[PDB]
């Protein structure tokens, strides 16, 4: 019964993962990354949760992480220079799809009868065209890693219905 909703949500997540890779690939072709750009405003990458007791924490964390990515994607569209202007509408599509995914996750969380505010980031516009390019690498790369983790976690949830 709950497995159908979950399988839909795994599919959406895989598709969002592919969307995120494609976007990162396009950026990379335009401006290859010059290092591993830590954005302080981004969440720390979650440690890849075998048991049924660990999974609620994983969903809670996943949601918190994706909301942060959602704010950062918006920020990139708002504050991106002409250097990102050609990727902006794809980012817009990505943001719609992430919004959709998040709502699915929240539903899933209510169907499973789980429990569970104040946001500061990402905030200020990049110091230069290059700063924004650096942030885009970090945002899309972090989102990629988070979704790949998400896929695996939702698969383990499936085991425990």
Q: How far apart are CA 84 and CA 156, in angstroms?
A: 37
Give the residue extent of every domain in the chain. 1-161
Q: Which residues contact 32 (CB under 8 A, 6 or more apart)?
A: none
* Record: fold of 1-161: Growth Hormone; Chain: A; (1.20.1250)
Helix (H) / strand (E) containing 53: none
Helices (H), the chain: 2-30, 55-79, 88-111, 129-159
Expressed in Å, this structure's resolution amounts to: 2.1
Structure determined via: X-ray
């Amino acid at each position: 019964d709950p497995r159908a909703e979950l399988d839909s949500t795994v599919l959406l997540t895989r598709s969002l993962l592919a969307d995120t890779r494609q976007l990162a690939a396009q950026l990379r072709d335009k401006f290859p990354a010059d290092g591993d750009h830590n954005l302080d405003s981004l969440p720390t990458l979650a440690m890849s949760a075998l048991g049924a007791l660990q999974l609620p924490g994983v969903l809670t964390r996943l949601r918190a992480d994706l909301l942060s990515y959602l704010r950062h994607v918006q920020w990139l569209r708002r504050a991106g220079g002409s250097s990102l202007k050609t990727l902006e509408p794809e980012l817009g599509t990505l943001q719609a799809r992430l919004d959709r995914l998040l709502r699915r996750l929240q539903l899933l969380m209510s169907r499973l009868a789980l429990p569970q505010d104040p946001p500061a980031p990402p905030l200020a516009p990049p110091s230069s065209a290059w700063g924004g390019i650096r942030a885009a690498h970090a945002i899309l790369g972090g989102l990629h890693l988070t979704l790949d983790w998400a896929v695996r976690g939702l698969l383990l949830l499936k085991t425990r219905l």
